[PDB]
Amino acid sequence: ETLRVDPTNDRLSALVEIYRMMRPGEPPTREAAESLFENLFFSEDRYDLS
């Protein structure tokens, strides 16, 4: 059901959705969206489970 409600289909459109939610209104890009998402949880200088 979540994939029913889920409007996006692929990593590009999903990253764009994430970018719109985080940094809203700004026109997204492929590169800016990917960079924001990777800097969310998988860049070592911005996310630390101690």
């Binding site: 719109r20 939610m21 809203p24 209104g25 700004e26």
Partner: protein, 43 residues
Amino acid sequence: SQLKLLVTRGKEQGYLTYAEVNDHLPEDIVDSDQIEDIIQMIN
């Protein structure tokens, strides 16, 4: 409609979490001042 749904759902619930307001407030808004004014009016 959206924020109207939020207002009516609140008025039937008697309360509103920050989460529900975030889900219901529009997506064009970027700054926090319009968001806090919306929260003030809605309160």
